[PDB]
């Protein structure tokens, strides 16, 4: 999604 550049995303 929109949580940094780390999964889930």
Tally DSSP H helices, then E strands, for the chain: 0, 0
Asked if residue 8 lies in contact with residue 2, where contact means CB atoms within 8 angstroms, the answer is no
CA–CA separation, 7 and 4 (whole Å): 8
Q: Residue 2 contacts by C-beta under 8 Å, 6 or more apart in sequence?
A: 9
Asked if residue 7 lies in contact with residue 1, where contact means CB atoms within 8 angstroms, the answer is no
Residue 4 φ/ψ region, left for φ over 0, alpha for ψ in the -120 to 50 degree band, beta for the rest? left
Q: Can you read off the two tokens belonging to residue 9?
A: 């995303």
Asked if residue 3 lies in contact with residue 9, where contact means CB atoms within 8 angstroms, the answer is yes
Is it true that the peptide bond before 8 is cis, omega within 30 degrees of 0? yes
Q: Tell me which DSSP letter residue 6 carries.
A: S
């Amino acid at each position: 999604x929109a949580a940094x550049l780390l999964l889930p995303x």
